[PDB]
Amino acid sequence: YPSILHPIDHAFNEYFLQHQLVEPLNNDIIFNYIPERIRNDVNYILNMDRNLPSTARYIRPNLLQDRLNLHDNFESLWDTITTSNYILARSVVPDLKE
């Protein structure tokens, strides 16, 4: 499309257009998004009963490992982190039957 923009405005908008965070989304990406050990567990049957158009997009989560090394020399913060993780894990652990 034609646009009228100040060179600074054009710089900003062109940066936004040229560096978008959306990547093509297909069933291979979703399948690899599943943890690899759950894809190999025979107790779980995983299927792809959806069709993704070529116009599908997604934004990759930033799963970079801890750059702050909060496990090192942050006793209180690490205590809090492990407490929160413990609460979440308690929420997801199954209940015994019979």
């Binding site: 923009l5 100040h6 062109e14 979703i30 049957i45 993704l52 116009t55 997009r57």
Partner: peptide
């Protein structure tokens, strides 16, 4: 005008999805 007229290029359309695991049909034995 010459220094301000630009052509802005993008995609015509796409759909962004957030919950990828919603596309997985998961059962258990």
């Amino acid at each position: 005008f010459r220094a301000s007229m630009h052509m802005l290029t993008s995609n015509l359309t796409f759909t962004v999805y957030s919950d990828l695991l919603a596309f997985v049909s998961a059962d258990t034995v």
